[PDB]
Design a protein around this motif. Structure first.
Motif, PDB file in Angstrom:
ATOM      1  N   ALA B  25      67.605  31.718  42.293  1.00 39.09           N
ATOM      2  CA  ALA B  25      67.474  32.722  41.231  1.00 39.09           C
ATOM      3  C   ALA B  25      68.787  33.463  41.006  1.00 39.09           C
ATOM      4  O   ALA B  25      69.559  33.677  41.925  1.00 39.09           O
ATOM      5  CB  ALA B  25      66.368  33.697  41.565  1.00 39.09           C
ATOM      6  N   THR B  26      69.068  33.800  39.758  1.00 37.34           N
ATOM      7  CA  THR B  26      70.088  34.801  39.448  1.00 37.34           C
ATOM      8  C   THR B  26      69.546  35.772  38.400  1.00 37.34           C
ATOM      9  O   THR B  26      68.641  35.444  37.636  1.00 37.34           O
ATOM     10  CB  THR B  26      71.376  34.166  38.931  1.00 37.34           C
ATOM     11  N   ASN B  27      70.112  36.975  38.372  1.00 31.98           N
ATOM     12  CA  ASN B  27      69.690  37.998  37.424  1.00 31.98           C
ATOM     13  C   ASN B  27      70.786  39.026  37.159  1.00 31.98           C
ATOM     14  O   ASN B  27      71.626  39.287  38.019  1.00 31.98           O
ATOM     15  CB  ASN B  27      68.421  38.696  37.917  1.00 31.98           C
ATOM     16  N   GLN B  28      70.768  39.605  35.963  1.00 30.19           N
ATOM     17  CA  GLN B  28      71.758  40.606  35.582  1.00 30.19           C
ATOM     18  C   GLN B  28      71.219  41.528  34.494  1.00 30.19           C
ATOM     19  O   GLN B  28      70.384  41.126  33.684  1.00 30.19           O
ATOM     20  CB  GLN B  28      73.047  39.931  35.108  1.00 30.19           C
ATOM     21  N   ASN B  29      71.701  42.768  34.483  1.00 34.57           N
ATOM     22  CA  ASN B  29      71.267  43.749  33.496  1.00 34.57           C
ATOM     23  C   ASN B  29      72.243  43.864  32.330  1.00 34.57           C
ATOM     24  O   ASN B  29      72.315  44.899  31.667  1.00 34.57           O
ATOM     25  CB  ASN B  29      71.067  45.117  34.151  1.00 34.57           C
ATOM     26  N   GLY B  30      72.994  42.795  32.086  1.00 30.65           N
ATOM     27  CA  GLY B  30      73.962  42.773  31.004  1.00 30.65           C
ATOM     28  C   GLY B  30      73.548  41.849  29.876  1.00 30.65           C
ATOM     29  O   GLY B  30      72.939  40.802  30.110  1.00 30.65           O
ATOM     30  N   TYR B  31      73.878  42.236  28.648  1.00 30.90           N
ATOM     31  CA  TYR B  31      73.536  41.436  27.477  1.00 30.90           C
ATOM     32  C   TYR B  31      74.146  42.028  26.210  1.00 30.90           C
ATOM     33  O   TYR B  31      74.474  43.211  26.161  1.00 30.90           O
ATOM     34  CB  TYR B  31      72.018  41.327  27.328  1.00 30.90           C
ATOM     35  N   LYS B  32      74.293  41.194  25.187  1.00 32.51           N
ATOM     36  CA  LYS B  32      74.859  41.631  23.915  1.00 32.51           C
ATOM     37  C   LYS B  32      73.851  41.482  22.781  1.00 32.51           C
ATOM     38  O   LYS B  32      73.579  40.373  22.321  1.00 32.51           O
ATOM     39  CB  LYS B  32      76.130  40.843  23.595  1.00 32.51           C
ATOM     40  N   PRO B  33      73.299  42.606  22.336  1.00 32.81           N
ATOM     41  CA  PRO B  33      72.313  42.602  21.249  1.00 32.81           C
ATOM     42  C   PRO B  33      72.690  41.622  20.145  1.00 32.81           C
ATOM     43  O   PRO B  33      73.851  41.223  20.044  1.00 32.81           O
ATOM     44  CB  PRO B  33      72.374  44.038  20.723  1.00 32.81           C
ATOM     45  N   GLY B  34      71.714  41.242  19.326  1.00 30.23           N
ATOM     46  CA  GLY B  34      70.358  41.734  19.474  1.00 30.23           C
ATOM     47  C   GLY B  34      69.757  42.185  18.158  1.00 30.23           C
ATOM     48  O   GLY B  34      70.376  42.938  17.407  1.00 30.23           O
ATOM     49  N   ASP B  35      68.543  41.721  17.878  1.00 32.28           N
ATOM     50  CA  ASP B  35      67.851  42.077  16.645  1.00 32.28           C
ATOM     51  C   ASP B  35      66.338  42.015  16.825  1.00 32.28           C
ATOM     52  O   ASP B  35      65.821  41.132  17.509  1.00 32.28           O
ATOM     53  CB  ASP B  35      68.283  41.156  15.502  1.00 32.28           C
ATOM     54  N   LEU B  36      65.633  42.956  16.206  1.00 37.99           N
ATOM     55  CA  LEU B  36      64.174  43.010  16.300  1.00 37.99           C
ATOM     56  C   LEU B  36      63.543  41.731  15.738  1.00 37.99           C
ATOM     57  O   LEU B  36      63.838  41.325  14.633  1.00 37.99           O
ATOM     58  CB  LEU B  36      63.632  44.220  15.552  1.00 37.99           C
ATOM     59  N   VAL B  37      62.724  41.064  16.539  1.00 40.67           N
ATOM     60  CA  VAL B  37      62.106  39.802  16.172  1.00 40.67           C
ATOM     61  C   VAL B  37      60.619  39.976  15.861  1.00 40.67           C
ATOM     62  O   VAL B  37      60.109  39.412  14.902  1.00 40.67           O
ATOM     63  CB  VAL B  37      62.315  38.785  17.298  1.00 40.67           C
ATOM     64  N   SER B  38      59.921  40.765  16.676  1.00 35.51           N
ATOM     65  CA  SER B  38      58.530  41.092  16.469  1.00 35.51           C
ATOM     66  C   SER B  38      58.265  42.432  17.157  1.00 35.51           C
ATOM     67  O   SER B  38      59.085  42.901  17.948  1.00 35.51           O
ATOM     68  CB  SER B  38      57.652  40.037  17.076  1.00 35.51           C
ATOM     69  N   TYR B  39      57.114  42.998  16.884  1.00 39.45           N
ATOM     70  CA  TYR B  39      56.626  44.191  17.591  1.00 39.45           C
ATOM     71  C   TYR B  39      55.144  44.028  17.805  1.00 39.45           C
ATOM     72  O   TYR B  39      54.474  43.208  17.144  1.00 39.45           O
ATOM     73  CB  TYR B  39      56.918  45.481  16.812  1.00 39.45           C
ATOM     74  N   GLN B  40      54.601  44.783  18.754  1.00 38.30           N
ATOM     75  CA  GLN B  40      53.233  44.578  19.125  1.00 38.30           C
ATOM     76  C   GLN B  40      52.612  45.875  19.596  1.00 38.30           C
ATOM     77  O   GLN B  40      53.310  46.785  20.046  1.00 38.30           O
ATOM     78  CB  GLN B  40      53.142  43.523  20.211  1.00 38.30           C
ATOM     79  N   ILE B  41      51.306  45.933  19.466  1.00 42.09           N
ATOM     80  CA  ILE B  41      50.489  46.984  20.044  1.00 42.09           C
ATOM     81  C   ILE B  41      49.669  46.304  21.144  1.00 42.09           C
ATOM     82  O   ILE B  41      48.879  45.381  20.883  1.00 42.09           O
ATOM     83  CB  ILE B  41      49.585  47.596  19.024  1.00 42.09           C
ATOM     84  N   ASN B  42      49.890  46.746  22.370  1.00 42.91           N
ATOM     85  CA  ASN B  42      49.122  46.266  23.525  1.00 42.91           C
ATOM     86  C   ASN B  42      47.728  46.930  23.595  1.00 42.91           C
ATOM     87  O   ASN B  42      47.435  47.845  22.843  1.00 42.91           O
ATOM     88  CB  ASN B  42      49.944  46.513  24.791  1.00 42.91           C
ATOM     89  N   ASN B  43      46.852  46.440  24.462  1.00 39.53           N
ATOM     90  CA  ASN B  43      45.471  46.934  24.472  1.00 39.53           C
ATOM     91  C   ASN B  43      45.300  48.333  25.098  1.00 39.53           C
ATOM     92  O   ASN B  43      44.207  48.899  25.019  1.00 39.53           O
ATOM     93  CB  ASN B  43      44.495  45.893  25.046  1.00 39.53           C
ATOM     94  N   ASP B  44      46.361  48.872  25.677  1.00 39.13           N
ATOM     95  CA  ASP B  44      46.439  50.283  26.095  1.00 39.13           C
ATOM     96  C   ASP B  44      47.207  51.141  25.072  1.00 39.13           C
ATOM     97  O   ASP B  44      47.601  52.278  25.374  1.00 39.13           O
ATOM     98  CB  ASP B  44      47.101  50.409  27.474  1.00 39.13           C
ATOM     99  N   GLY B  45      47.445  50.576  23.886  1.00 44.42           N
ATOM    100  CA  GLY B  45      48.113  51.281  22.799  1.00 44.42           C
ATOM    101  C   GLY B  45      49.637  51.411  22.890  1.00 44.42           C
ATOM    102  O   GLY B  45      50.268  52.060  22.031  1.00 44.42           O
ATOM    103  N   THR B  46      50.247  50.886  23.952  1.00 46.17           N
ATOM    104  CA  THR B  46      51.692  50.855  24.039  1.00 46.17           C
ATOM    105  C   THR B  46      52.272  49.986  22.944  1.00 46.17           C
ATOM    106  O   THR B  46      51.757  48.914  22.647  1.00 46.17           O
ATOM    107  CB  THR B  46      52.194  50.383  25.403  1.00 46.17           C
ATOM    108  N   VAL B  47      53.327  50.477  22.321  1.00 49.97           N
ATOM    109  CA  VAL B  47      53.974  49.791  21.214  1.00 49.97           C
ATOM    110  C   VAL B  47      55.318  49.300  21.738  1.00 49.97           C
ATOM    111  O   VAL B  47      56.120  50.086  22.270  1.00 49.97           O
ATOM    112  CB  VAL B  47      54.201  50.751  20.030  1.00 49.97           C
ATOM    113  N   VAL B  48      55.548  47.992  21.632  1.00 54.11           N
ATOM    114  CA  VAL B  48      56.725  47.323  22.199  1.00 54.11           C
ATOM    115  C   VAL B  48      57.453  46.477  21.126  1.00 54.11           C
ATOM    116  O   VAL B  48      56.814  45.800  20.319  1.00 54.11           O
ATOM    117  CB  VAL B  48      56.274  46.438  23.385  1.00 54.11           C
ATOM    118  N   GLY B  49      58.769  46.609  21.087  1.00 56.87           N
ATOM    119  CA  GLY B  49      59.623  45.734  20.299  1.00 56.87           C
ATOM    120  C   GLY B  49      60.169  44.581  21.132  1.00 56.87           C
ATOM    121  O   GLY B  49      60.539  44.756  22.308  1.00 56.87           O
ATOM    122  N   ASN B  50      60.267  43.425  20.491  1.00 57.98           N
ATOM    123  CA  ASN B  50      60.742  42.196  21.108  1.00 57.98           C
ATOM    124  C   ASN B  50      62.039  41.820  20.384  1.00 57.98           C
ATOM    125  O   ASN B  50      62.065  41.785  19.149  1.00 57.98           O
ATOM    126  CB  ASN B  50      59.690  41.097  20.986  1.00 57.98           C
TER     127      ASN B  50
END
Lengths: 151, 50
Positions: B25-50
């Protein structure tokens, strides 16, 4: 463990001393591969030398360790009674050599269920060990009593 | 452009008794945006952008 059937009619070898390199200095050789905590395999050679009626000296040697001293003293002696059932010497602690700077394995070697036949050829029927080097999940299953097992 | 400076962690790395050297495994908290592709409302009402 090593279960062996030994032949009561076997000769006492005339060639002395016992040596892992002289094939007519012992009656039978077997092998069991054990592991240390690093997971190195040690190929443990086990040699049976009939000393007199119903008694067999057993030498062991880690064939996987070039610095290991040649076995000149027996690790145990198997004594069988008149019916060819193992009576004593069937359990012995063995310490391996070392490989690539890793610590040795120390294990109880058992000859349980070994017998001396009235007539036959020396023959190892079974070996077993609780050592191994992982290892990766290949499948899993639910049995019909709901037990969940990884393979 | 200015360099990145980051903590590199080998957490959960192990030396096997026997195997082949292998990165799991490898992992990192770095990245270069980036554009909104979809958004969603989860079943606990949390609203998330993808």
């Amino acid at each position: 463990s090593m279960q062996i059937n030994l032949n009561s009619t076997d000769p006492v070898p005339s060639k002395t001393p016992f040596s892992v390199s002289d094939a007519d200095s012992y009656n039978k050789k077997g092998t069991v591969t054990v592991y240390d905590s690093q997971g190195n395999a040690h190929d443990m050679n086990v040699y049976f030398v009939k000393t007199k009626d119903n008694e067999w000296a057993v030498y062991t040697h880690d064939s996987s360790d070039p610095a290991a001293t040649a076995p000149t003293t027996a690790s145990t002696t198997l004594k069988f009674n008149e019916n060819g059932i193992l009576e004593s010497g069937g359990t012995v602690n063995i310490t391996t050599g070392t490989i690539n700077g890793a610590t040795a394995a120390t294990f109880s070697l058992s000859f349980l269920n070994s017998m001396q036949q009235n007539t036959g050829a020396n023959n190892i029927v079974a070996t077993n060990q609780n050592g191994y080097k992982p290892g990766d999940l290949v499948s899993y299953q639910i049995n019909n009593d709901g037990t969940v097992v990884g393979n």
